[PDB]
XYZ file of C-alpha atoms in Angstrom:
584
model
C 109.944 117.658 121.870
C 107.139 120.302 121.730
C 105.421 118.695 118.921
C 103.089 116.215 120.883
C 99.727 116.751 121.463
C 98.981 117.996 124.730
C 97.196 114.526 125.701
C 99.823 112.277 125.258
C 102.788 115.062 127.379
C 102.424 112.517 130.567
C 103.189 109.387 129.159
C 105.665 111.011 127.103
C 108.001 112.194 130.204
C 107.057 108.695 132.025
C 107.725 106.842 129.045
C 111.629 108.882 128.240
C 112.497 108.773 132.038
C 111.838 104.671 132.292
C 113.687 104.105 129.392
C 117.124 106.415 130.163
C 116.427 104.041 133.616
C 116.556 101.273 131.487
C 112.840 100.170 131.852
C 111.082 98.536 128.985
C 107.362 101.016 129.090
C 104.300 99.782 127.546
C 102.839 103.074 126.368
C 99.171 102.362 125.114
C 97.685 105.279 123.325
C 94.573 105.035 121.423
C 94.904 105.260 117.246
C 94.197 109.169 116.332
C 96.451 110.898 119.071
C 99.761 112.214 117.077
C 101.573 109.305 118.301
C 104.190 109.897 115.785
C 105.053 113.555 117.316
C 106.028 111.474 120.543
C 108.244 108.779 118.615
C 110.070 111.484 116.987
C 110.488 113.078 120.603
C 111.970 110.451 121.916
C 114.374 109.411 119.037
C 115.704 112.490 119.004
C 116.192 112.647 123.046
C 118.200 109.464 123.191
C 119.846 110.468 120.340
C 121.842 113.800 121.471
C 123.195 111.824 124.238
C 124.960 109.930 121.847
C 123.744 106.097 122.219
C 122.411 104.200 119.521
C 118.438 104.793 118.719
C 116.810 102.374 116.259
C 112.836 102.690 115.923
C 111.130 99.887 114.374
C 108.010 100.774 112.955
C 105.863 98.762 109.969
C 107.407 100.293 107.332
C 103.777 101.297 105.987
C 103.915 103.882 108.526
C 107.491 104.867 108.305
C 106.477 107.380 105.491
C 104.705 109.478 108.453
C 106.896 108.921 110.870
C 109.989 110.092 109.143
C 108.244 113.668 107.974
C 107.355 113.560 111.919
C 111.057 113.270 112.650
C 112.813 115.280 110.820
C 110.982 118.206 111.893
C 112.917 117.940 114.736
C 116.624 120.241 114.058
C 118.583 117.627 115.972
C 117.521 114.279 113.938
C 119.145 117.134 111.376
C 122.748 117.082 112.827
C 122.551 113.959 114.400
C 121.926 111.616 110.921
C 118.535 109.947 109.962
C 118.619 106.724 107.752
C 116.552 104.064 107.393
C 118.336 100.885 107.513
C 116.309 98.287 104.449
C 117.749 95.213 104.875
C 116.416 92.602 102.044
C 114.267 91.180 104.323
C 111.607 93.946 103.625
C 111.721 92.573 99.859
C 110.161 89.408 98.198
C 111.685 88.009 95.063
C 109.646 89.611 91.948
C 110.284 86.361 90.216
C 109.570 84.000 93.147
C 106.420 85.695 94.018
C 104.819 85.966 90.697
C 105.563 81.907 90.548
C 103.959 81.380 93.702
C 101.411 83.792 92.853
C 100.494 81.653 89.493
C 100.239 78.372 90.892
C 98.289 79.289 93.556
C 95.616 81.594 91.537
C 96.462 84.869 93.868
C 95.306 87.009 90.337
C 95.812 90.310 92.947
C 99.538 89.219 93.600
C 100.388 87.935 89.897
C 98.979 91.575 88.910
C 100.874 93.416 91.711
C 103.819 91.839 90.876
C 103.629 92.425 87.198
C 102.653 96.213 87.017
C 106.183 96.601 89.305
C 105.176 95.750 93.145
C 104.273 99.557 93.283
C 103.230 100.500 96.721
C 99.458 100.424 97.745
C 114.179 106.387 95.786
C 110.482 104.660 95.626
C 109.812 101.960 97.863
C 108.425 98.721 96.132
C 108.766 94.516 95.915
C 107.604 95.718 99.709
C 106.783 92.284 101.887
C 104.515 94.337 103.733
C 102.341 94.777 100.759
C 102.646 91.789 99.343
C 101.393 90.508 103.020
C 98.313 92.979 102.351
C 97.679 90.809 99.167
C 98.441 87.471 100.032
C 97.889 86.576 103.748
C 99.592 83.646 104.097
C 102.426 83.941 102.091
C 105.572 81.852 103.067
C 107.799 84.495 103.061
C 110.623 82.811 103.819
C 111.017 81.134 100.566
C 110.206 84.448 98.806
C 112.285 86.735 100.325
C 114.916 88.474 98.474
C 117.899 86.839 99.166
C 122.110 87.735 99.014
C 121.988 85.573 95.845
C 119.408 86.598 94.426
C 120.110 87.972 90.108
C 121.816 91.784 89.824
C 119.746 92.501 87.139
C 116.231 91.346 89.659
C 114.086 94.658 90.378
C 114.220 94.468 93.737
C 117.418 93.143 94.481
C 118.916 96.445 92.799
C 116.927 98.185 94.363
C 117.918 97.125 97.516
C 121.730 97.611 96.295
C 120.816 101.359 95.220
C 119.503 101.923 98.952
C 122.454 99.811 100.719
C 124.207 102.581 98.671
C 122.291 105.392 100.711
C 123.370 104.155 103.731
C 125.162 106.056 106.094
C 125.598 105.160 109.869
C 123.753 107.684 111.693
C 122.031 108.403 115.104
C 118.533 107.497 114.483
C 118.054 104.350 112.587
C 114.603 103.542 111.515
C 113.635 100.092 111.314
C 111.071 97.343 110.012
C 109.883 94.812 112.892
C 111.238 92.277 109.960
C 114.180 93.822 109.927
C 114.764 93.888 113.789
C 113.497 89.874 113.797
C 116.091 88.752 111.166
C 118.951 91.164 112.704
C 118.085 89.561 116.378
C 118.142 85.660 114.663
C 120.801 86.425 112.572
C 122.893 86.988 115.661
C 121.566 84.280 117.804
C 123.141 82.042 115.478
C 126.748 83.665 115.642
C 127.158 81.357 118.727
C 123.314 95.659 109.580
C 122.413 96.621 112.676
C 123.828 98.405 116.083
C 124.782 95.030 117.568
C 123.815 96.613 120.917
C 120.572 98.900 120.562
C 120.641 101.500 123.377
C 117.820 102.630 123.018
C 114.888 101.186 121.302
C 110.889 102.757 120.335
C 108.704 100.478 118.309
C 105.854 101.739 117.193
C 102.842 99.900 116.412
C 104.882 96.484 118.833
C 101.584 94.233 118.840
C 102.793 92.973 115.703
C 106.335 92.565 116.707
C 105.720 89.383 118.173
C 104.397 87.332 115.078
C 106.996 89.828 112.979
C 109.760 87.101 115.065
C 107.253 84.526 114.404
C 107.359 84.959 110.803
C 111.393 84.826 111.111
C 111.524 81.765 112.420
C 108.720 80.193 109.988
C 110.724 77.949 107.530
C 108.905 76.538 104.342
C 109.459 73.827 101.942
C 107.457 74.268 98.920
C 108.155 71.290 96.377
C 106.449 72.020 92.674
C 108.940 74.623 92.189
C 111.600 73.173 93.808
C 111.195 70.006 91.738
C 110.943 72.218 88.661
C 114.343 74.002 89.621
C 116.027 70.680 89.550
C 115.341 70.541 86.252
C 122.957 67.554 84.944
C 124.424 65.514 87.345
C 122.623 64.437 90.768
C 119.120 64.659 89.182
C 117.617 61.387 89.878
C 119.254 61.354 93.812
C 117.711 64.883 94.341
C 114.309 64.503 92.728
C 113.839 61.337 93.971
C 114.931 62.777 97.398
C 112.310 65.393 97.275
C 109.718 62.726 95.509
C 110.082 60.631 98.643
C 109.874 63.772 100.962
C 106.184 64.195 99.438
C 105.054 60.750 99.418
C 105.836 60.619 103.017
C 104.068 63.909 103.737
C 100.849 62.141 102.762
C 101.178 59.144 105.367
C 100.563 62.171 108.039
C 97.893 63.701 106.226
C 95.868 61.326 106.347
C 97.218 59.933 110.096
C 96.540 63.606 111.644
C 92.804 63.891 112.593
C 92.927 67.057 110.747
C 95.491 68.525 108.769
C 95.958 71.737 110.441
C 97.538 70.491 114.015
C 101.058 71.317 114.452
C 102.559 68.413 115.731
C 106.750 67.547 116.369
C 109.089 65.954 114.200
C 108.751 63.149 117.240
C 105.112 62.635 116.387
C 105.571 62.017 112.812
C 109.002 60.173 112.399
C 107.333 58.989 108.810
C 109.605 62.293 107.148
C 112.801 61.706 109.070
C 114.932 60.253 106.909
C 113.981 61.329 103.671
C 114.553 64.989 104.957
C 118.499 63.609 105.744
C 118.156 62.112 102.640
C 117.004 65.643 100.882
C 119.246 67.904 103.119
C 122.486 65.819 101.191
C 121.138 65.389 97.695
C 120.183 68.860 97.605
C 123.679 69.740 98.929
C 125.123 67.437 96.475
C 123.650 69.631 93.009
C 126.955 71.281 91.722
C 126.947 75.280 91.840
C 129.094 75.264 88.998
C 126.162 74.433 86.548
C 123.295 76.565 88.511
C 122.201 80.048 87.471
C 122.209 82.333 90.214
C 118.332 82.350 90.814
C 118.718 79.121 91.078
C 121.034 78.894 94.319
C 118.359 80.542 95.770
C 115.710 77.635 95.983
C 118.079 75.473 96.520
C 119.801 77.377 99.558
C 116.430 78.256 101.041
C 114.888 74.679 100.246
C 118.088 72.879 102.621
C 117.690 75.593 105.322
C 114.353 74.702 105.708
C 115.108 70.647 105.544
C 117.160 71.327 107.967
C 115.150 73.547 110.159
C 112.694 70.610 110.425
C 115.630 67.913 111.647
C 116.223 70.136 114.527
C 116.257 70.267 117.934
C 113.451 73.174 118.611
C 110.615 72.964 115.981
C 106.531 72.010 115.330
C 105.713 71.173 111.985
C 102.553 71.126 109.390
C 101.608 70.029 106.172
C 99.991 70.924 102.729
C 99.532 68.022 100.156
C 97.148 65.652 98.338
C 93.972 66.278 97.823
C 92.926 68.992 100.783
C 95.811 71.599 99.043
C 97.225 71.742 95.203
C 100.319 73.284 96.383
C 102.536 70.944 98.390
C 104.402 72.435 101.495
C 105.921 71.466 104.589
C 105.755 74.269 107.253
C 108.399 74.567 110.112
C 108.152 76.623 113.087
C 109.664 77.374 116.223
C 106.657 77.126 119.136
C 108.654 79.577 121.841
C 110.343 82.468 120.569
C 112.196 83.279 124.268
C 115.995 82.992 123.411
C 115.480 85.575 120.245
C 113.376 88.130 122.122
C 115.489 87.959 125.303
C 118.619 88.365 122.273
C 116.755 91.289 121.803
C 116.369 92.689 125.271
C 119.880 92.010 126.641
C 121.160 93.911 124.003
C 118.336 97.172 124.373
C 119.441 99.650 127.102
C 115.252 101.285 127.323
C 112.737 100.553 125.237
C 109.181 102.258 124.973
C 106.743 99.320 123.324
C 103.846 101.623 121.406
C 100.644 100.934 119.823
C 97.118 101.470 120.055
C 96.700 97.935 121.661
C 99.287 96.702 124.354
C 97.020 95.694 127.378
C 93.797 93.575 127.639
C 92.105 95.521 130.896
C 93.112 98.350 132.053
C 97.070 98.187 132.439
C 97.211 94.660 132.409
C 100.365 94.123 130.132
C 100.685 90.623 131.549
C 99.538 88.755 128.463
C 101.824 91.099 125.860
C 104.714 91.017 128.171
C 104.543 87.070 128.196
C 104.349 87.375 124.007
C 107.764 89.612 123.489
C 109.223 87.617 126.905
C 110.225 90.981 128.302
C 111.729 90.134 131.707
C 109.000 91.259 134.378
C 112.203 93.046 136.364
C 112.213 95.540 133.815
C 108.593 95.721 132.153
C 106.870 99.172 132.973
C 103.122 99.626 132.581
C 102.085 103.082 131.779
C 98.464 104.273 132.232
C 96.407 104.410 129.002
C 95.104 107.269 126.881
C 92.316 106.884 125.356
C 90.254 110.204 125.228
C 86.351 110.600 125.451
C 85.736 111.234 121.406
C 87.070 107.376 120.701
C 83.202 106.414 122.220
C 81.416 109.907 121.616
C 80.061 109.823 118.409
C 79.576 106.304 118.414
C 75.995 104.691 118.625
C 75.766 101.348 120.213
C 72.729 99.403 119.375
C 71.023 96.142 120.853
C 69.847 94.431 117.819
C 71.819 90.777 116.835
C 71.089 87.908 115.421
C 69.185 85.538 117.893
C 71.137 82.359 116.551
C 74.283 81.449 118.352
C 76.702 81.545 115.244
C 77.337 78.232 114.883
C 78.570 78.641 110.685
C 75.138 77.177 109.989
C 72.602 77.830 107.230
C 69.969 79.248 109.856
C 72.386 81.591 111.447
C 73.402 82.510 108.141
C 70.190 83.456 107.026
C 68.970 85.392 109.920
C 72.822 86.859 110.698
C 72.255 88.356 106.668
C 68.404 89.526 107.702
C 70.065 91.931 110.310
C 72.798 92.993 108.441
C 70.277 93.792 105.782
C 68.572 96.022 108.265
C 71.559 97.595 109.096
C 72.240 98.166 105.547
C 69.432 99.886 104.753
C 69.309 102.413 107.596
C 73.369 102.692 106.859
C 74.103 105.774 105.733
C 77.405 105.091 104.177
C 80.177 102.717 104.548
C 79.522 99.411 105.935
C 82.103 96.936 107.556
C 81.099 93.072 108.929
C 83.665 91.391 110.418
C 83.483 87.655 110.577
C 85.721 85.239 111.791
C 85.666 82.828 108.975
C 86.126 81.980 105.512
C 82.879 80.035 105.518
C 80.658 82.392 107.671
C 81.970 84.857 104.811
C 80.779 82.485 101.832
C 77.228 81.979 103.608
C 76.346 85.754 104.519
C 78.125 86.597 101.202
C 75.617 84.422 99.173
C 72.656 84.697 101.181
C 73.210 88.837 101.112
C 73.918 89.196 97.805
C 70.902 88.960 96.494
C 69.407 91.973 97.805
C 72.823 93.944 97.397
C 75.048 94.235 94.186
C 77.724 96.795 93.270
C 77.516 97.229 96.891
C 78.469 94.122 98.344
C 82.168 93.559 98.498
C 83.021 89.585 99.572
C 86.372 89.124 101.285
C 87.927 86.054 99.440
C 90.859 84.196 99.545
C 91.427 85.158 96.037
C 89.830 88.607 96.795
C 92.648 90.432 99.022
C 92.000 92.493 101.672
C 93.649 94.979 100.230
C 91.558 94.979 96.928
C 88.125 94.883 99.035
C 89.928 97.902 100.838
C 90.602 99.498 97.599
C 86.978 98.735 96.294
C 85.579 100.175 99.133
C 87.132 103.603 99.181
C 86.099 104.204 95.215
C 82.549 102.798 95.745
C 82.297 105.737 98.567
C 84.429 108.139 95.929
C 80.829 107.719 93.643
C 78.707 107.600 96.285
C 77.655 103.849 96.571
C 76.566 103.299 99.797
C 79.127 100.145 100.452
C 78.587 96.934 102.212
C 82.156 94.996 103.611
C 82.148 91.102 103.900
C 85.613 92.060 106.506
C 87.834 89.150 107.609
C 90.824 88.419 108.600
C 92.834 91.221 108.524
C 89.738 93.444 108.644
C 90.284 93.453 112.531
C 93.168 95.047 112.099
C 95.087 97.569 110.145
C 92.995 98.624 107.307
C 92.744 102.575 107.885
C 88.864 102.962 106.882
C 89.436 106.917 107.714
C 88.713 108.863 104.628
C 92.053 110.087 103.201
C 90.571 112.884 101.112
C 89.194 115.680 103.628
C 91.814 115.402 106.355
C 91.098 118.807 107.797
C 87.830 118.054 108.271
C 86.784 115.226 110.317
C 82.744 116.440 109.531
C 80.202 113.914 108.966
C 82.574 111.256 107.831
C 80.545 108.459 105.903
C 82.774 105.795 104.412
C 82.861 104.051 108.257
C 79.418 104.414 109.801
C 78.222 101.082 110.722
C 80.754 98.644 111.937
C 79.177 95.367 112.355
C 80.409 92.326 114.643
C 78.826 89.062 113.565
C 80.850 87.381 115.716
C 83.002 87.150 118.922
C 86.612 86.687 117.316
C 87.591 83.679 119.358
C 90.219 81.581 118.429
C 91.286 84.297 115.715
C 94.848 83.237 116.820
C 96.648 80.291 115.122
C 99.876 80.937 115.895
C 102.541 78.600 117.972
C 103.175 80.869 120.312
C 100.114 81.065 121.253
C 98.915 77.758 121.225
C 101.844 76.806 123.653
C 100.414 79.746 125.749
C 97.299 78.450 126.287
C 98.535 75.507 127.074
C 100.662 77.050 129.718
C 98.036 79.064 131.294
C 94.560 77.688 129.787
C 91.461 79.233 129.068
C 91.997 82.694 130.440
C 94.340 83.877 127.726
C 92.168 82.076 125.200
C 89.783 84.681 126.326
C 92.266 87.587 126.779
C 93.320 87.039 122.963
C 89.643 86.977 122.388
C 89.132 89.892 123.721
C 92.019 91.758 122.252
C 91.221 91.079 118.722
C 87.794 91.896 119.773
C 89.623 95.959 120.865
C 91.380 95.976 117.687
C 88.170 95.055 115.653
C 86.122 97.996 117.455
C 88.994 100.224 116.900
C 88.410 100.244 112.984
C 85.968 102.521 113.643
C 86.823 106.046 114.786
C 90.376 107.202 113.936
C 90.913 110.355 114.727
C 89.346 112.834 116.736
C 85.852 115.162 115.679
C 84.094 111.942 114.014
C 80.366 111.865 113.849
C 77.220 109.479 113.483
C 79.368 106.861 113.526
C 77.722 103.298 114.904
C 78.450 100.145 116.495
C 76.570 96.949 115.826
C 77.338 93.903 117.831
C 75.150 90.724 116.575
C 76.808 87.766 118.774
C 73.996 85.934 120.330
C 76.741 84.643 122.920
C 76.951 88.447 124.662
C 73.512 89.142 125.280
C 72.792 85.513 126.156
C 74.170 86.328 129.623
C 76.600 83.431 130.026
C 79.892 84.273 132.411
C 82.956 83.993 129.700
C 80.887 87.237 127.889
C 82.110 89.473 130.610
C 85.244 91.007 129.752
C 83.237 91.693 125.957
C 80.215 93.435 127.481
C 83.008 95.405 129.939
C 84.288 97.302 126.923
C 80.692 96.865 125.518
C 79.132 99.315 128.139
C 81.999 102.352 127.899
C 79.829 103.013 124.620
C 76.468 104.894 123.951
């Protein structure tokens, strides 16, 4: 209990007192504040009274978090385990495929050299999520059929091996999402959670998203097929894609997730598919096999449902065919969730939008307002002390435009030459990357680094931190997942935070609106309009300023915001400039 920092000792006692109550706390507290000691804390208090304690963390962070916990003697007699289900594992196999055919070099290298991490933990989905964004991890997950003689499958049977039920169980937010589905659909986990801490929660919510994402990819599918059934099944599946094409082409653009009422044109050659695919004999199938084939009918089916948007992938706008299912309100799981947690303490660096105001995250992870708690925040002086705000951005409203590209890549240039080290730019598209990216390179090589889909984040992460090892003064095309969770802190000196130079200048071409294109959130702003358009806005706009400073005793650190939009003083700027003028 003594470990925390003497900071975060409030919300601590709030935050265990609400939860024995049965409360569900939001405790916010700012990235660099030993949240860890206070997870461990509370694990270990609702463990020696005896009820269940599971804390889901991302499992990158479950390294730390278990050398926080076990510090503490009771976690000693009351057992520690970590409960892997395979849902933290791809398939090896499957992934390298996918990986091929859809020119992902990073993952097809990954994969071969051993899905090492960026017992020994590896084939980790949260890693391969690092390389490949948008990987449909549904149909590359390891599965219970999956071969015995597959990497990852044994090593998920030489952990399963290592389990022991125990007081503390630490957890995946994957793990928790499939556990929570897998028993809404009864009618390895504590079937009733008493108590519950998840660290890092603002990626719970798409964590259940991604659990109830179903994907029906066809090339290797078809391929699988390859006995007897083979003209009924491929020509079930042939028919599947031919009528994916008479909706991409209908939808004004491809990308609008629309019912399975909209578009009856798949109906009945998914019925046709979800039998012909059922009708393949198992005697005659290798075991990898079964596994395509079971995951290819669950996701048929998934999309002749009662409760599901779809989207597709075909023709000419995308080489690699694929039908995407999911589920656009994600209240019965979540509230599966809550009925069976006795407290739970949601924690993470970014919970509210103002303030306290837990409203918007509380109507993400539908925690019942009757039991939602909103804990003051803690974010101490030093997360805006050494930082630098400056005035300078480009005059032209970022409209992804050749002119705004140009003069957007004349300021960053600027900013690049007074940098003194590190250098991240966080856009808000692929295209506003390509433009700046070409226009900027010119003047910079071997210190440009262009966020790609083919380039990971993870490898321009990678390339960042040796071109500051040599002392290249490093320039960061950041996107996408740049906003959040890349650690930029330099991992070397730790017990120094000195004159830290591999973040300096963080750089915000744009306001990241509309960074959000999940369900959930589209049938949220459609609930409650514009406001929590902006409220997202504004919370991936938190997350992107919080790359910055990461720990406390940083210096000559600076902030560069270059929307035109926020000093153009319109009205929908105003929560932006309200965390714009806590700095300098």
């Amino acid at each position: 209990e003594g470990a925390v920092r003497e900071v975060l000792r409030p919300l601590l006692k709030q935050a265990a007192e609400k939860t024995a109550a049965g409360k569900i706390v939001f405790a916010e507290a700012a990235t660099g504040t030993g949240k860890g000691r206070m997870i461990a804390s509370l694990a270990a208090a609702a463990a020696i009274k005896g009820d269940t304690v599971v804390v889901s963390a991302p499992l990158a962070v479950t390294w730390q978090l278990v050398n926080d916990m076990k510090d503490i003697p009771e976690v000693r007699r009351v057992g520690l385990t970590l409960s892997l289900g395979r849902p933290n594992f791809i398939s090896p196999q499957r992934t390298l495929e996918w990986a091929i055919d859809n020119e992902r070099a990073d993952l097809a290298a990954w994969i071969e050299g051993g899905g090492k991490p960026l017992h020994e933990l590896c084939w980790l989905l949260e890693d391969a999520l690092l390389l490949a964004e948008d990987l449909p991890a549904d149909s590359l997950l390891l599965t219970s059929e999956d071969p015995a003689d597959c990497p990852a499958q044994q090593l998920y049977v030489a952990m399963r091996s290592n389990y022991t039920e125990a007081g503390i169980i630490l957890c995946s937010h994957f793990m928790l999402a499939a556990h929570t589905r897998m028993m809404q659909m009864r009618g390895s986990l504590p079937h009733f959670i008493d108590t519950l801490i998840v660290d890092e929660a603002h990626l719970l919510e798409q964590a259940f998203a991604s659990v109830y994402t179903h994907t029906l990819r066809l090339r290797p599918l078809m391929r699988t097929i390859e006995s007897r059934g083979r003209k009924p099944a491929l020509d079930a599946l042939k028919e599947l894609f031919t009528q994916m094409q008479v909706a991409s082409a209908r939808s004004t653009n491809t990308s609008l997730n629309v019912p399975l009422s909209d578009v009856p044109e798949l109906i009945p050659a998914l019925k046709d598919t979800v039998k012909t695919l059922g009708a393949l004999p198992t005697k005659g199938m290798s075991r990898d096999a079964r596994s395509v084939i079971r995951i290819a009918t669950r996701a048929a089916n998934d999309a002749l449902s009662g409760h599901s948007r779809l989207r597709i992938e075909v023709t000419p706008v995308h080489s690699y065919p694929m039908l995407l299912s999911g589920r656009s309100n994600l209240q019965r799981a979540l509230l599966g969730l809550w009925n069976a947690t006795g407290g739970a303490t949601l924690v993470s660096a970014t919970l509210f939008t103002t303030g306290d105001n837990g409203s918007l995250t509380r109507w993400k992870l539908e925690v019942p307002t009757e039991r939602a708690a909103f804990l003051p925040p803690v974010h101490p002086a030093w997360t805006t002390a050494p930082v630098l705000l400056h005035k300078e951005f480009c005059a032209h409203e970022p409209d992804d435009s050749p002119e705004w590209a140009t003069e957007c890549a004349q300021t960053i240039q600027g900013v690049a030459s007074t940098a003194q080290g590190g250098t991240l730019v966080l856009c808000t598209s692929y295209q506003n990357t390509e433009l700046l990216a070409g226009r900027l390179g010119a003047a910079l090589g071997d210190r440009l680094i262009v966020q790609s889909k083919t380039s990971s984040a993870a490898t321009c992460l990678a390339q960042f931190k040796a071109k500051h090892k040599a002392g290249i003064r490093p320039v960061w095309l950041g996107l996408g997942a740049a906003w959040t969770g890349i650690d930029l802190s330099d991992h070397s000196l730790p017990d120094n935070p000195e004159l830290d130079r591999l973040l300096s200048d963080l750089v915000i071409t744009r306001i990241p609106v509309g960074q959000n294109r999940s369900l959930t959130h589209e049938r949220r702003t459609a609930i409650g309009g514009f406001r929590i358009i902006s409220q997202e806005a504004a919370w991936h706009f938190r997350q992107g300023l919080g790359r910055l400073v990461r720990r406390p005793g940083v210096t000559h650190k600076n902030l560069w915001v270059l929307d035109a939009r926020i000093y153009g003083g319109a009205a929908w700027v105003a929560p932006f400039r309200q965390i714009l003028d806590r700095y300098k």
